[PDB]
Write a protein that binds this DNA or RNA. Structure first.
Ligand SMILES: Cc1cn([C@H]2CC[C@@H](COP(=O)(O)OP(=O)(O)OP(=O)(O)O)O2)c(=O)[nH]c1=O
Ligand SMILES: [Mg+2]
Ligand code: NA
Ligand code: NA
Length: 324
DNA sequence: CGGCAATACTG
DNA sequence: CAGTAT
DNA sequence: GCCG
């Protein structure tokens, strides 16, 4: 909700991110993800330090954007950054691949297309490069969720289908469509991916598969590309997860996010000797001196999302209140 | 000093 | 496993 | 980067 001083920081955060300095980029993310949820412009160095997420190092940079109106750090960002960002926006390519391609002399998508060795996923990502950078209106996301739900309830009307992610958080636009599928009887959700996916392929709704371990009967997620019928339609990313009714609440909480919200909640659980994943909320978890899990602990009953919050000693938050 | 979420595929 | 993804 |  404020301080365009962040637009200068966002640039650095993205630079460190594409370059692989993930932890540093996370630090900037939180500092920025904070300078927004805040209220008044920061006018003092000590007034910065006071904000949770901002430190002495960050404050000194927040003073050069006000006292000087410009951050000199941006003037020394590697010329490789724009290219690394270009490359890492290819679905399936991350910082490691982008850096490798850059080191190999590649500088444009034309270079990637004609000379780079692409994985199957990356070839799909490049083929839909522009489309994958666009967000769809939530109205279209509804159409996509309904298309999957109809095909699902087609072979089992008992299947519960819910659109999660940014859609459930009530955003105006959606990057992809995240559909969670389960079954109230807690058993019939058995290997339905085969039937659902082949049904969606049957009607030409699915165009490309990115992640889909279909040889496996334990498949949990399907990440792919779909496109609604008619003219003026673009390819949209689709992410579907089938979960046992037993893990419905945690799966719903997870898939709804946001990402930063999930990380915050999971971090809280850890401080309480507990653990949260899309599968369950556990207590009495044993972790070594490195926060690594050594002992599983006990799964706690979590029939509903509110239960998870309750068990964590947190007040319930509607999906729209989790848009962190 | 050293964690910063916890998990699922791919090859 | 590393890399990438949610 | 931040912070316990
Ligand atoms: C990326 C990521 C995501 N999640 C969860 C929580 C969100 C859902 C859906 O992710 P998505 O990227 O579609 O996000 P979404 O919120 O739907 O935003 P878009 O509208 O799709 O961009 O997955 C997570 O726990 N950790 C992560 O690192
Ligand atoms: Mg989404
Ligand atoms: Na990418
Ligand atoms: Na497959």
């Amino acid at each position: 909700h404020n301080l365009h001083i962040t637009e200068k920081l966002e640039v650095l955060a993205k630079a460190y991110s594409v370059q692989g300095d993930k932890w540093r980029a996370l630090g900037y993310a939180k500092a920025i993800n904070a300078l927004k949820s805040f209220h008044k412009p920061v006018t003092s160095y000590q007034e910065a330090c006071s904000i949770p997420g901002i430190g002495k190092r960050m404050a000194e940079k927040i003073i050069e954007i006000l006292e000087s109106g410009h951050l000199r750090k941006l003037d020394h960002i590697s010329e490789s950054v724009p290219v690394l960002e270009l490359f890492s926006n290819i679905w399936g390519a991350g910082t490691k691949t982008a850096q490798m391609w850059y080191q190999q002399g590649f500088r444009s998508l034309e270079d990637i297309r004609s000379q780079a060795s692409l994985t199957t996923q990356q070839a799909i990502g490049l083929k839909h490069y522009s489309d994958f950078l666009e967000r769809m209106p939530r109205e279209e996301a509804t159409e996509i969720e309904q298309t999957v739900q109809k095909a699902a309830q087609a072979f089992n009307s008992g299947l519960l289908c819910v659109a999660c992610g940014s859609y459930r958080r009530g955003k105006a636009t959606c990057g992809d469509v995240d559909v969670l599928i389960t079954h109230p009887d807690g058993r019939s959700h058995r290997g339905i991916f085969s039937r659902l996916l082949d049904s969606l392929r049957q009607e030409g709704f699915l165009t490309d598969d990115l992640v889909s371990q279909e040889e496996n009967g334990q498949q949990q997620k399907y990440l792919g590309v779909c496109r609604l019928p008619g003219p003026g339609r673009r390819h949209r990313r689709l992410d579907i997860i089938v979960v046992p009714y037993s893990e419905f609440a945690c799966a719903l909480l997870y898939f709804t996010g946001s990402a930063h919200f999930n990380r915050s909640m999971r971090a809280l659980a850890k401080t309480k000797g507990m653990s949260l994943s899309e599968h369950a909320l556990s207590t009495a978890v044993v972790r070594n001196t490195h926060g690594a899990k050594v002992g599983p602990g006990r799964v706690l009953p979590t029939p509903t999302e509110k239960d998870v919050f309750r068990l964590l000693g947190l007040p319930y938050r509607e999906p729209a209140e989790r848009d962190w």
